[PDB]
Amino acid sequence: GPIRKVLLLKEDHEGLGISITGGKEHGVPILISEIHPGQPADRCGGLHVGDAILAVNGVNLRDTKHKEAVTILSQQRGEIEFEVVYV
């Protein structure tokens, strides 16, 4: 698919509201596997199960291990831009 950039707005106490799979060690991109009702990804829309997360706020996640990606994603605050493509 075409690359999209999608903004999420996250209150400081909440998570992004997604589950992810994949990563470098798995030979596949970081993939959104779940979108959690009522949480930022769900409320803002634009993200979907099956989207690959290529980058977040300018951090390239295309070659990061799963855990590295989790950590980077968990550190993001406030207004967060995802670069995604539907694979």
């Binding site: 998570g15 589950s19 992810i20 799979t21 990563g23 798995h26 779940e34 799963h66 989790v70 968990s74």
Partner: peptide, 6 residues
């Protein structure tokens, strides 16, 4: 399967 909630 590796899956993480964030």
């Amino acid at each position: 399967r590796r899956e993480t909630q964030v």
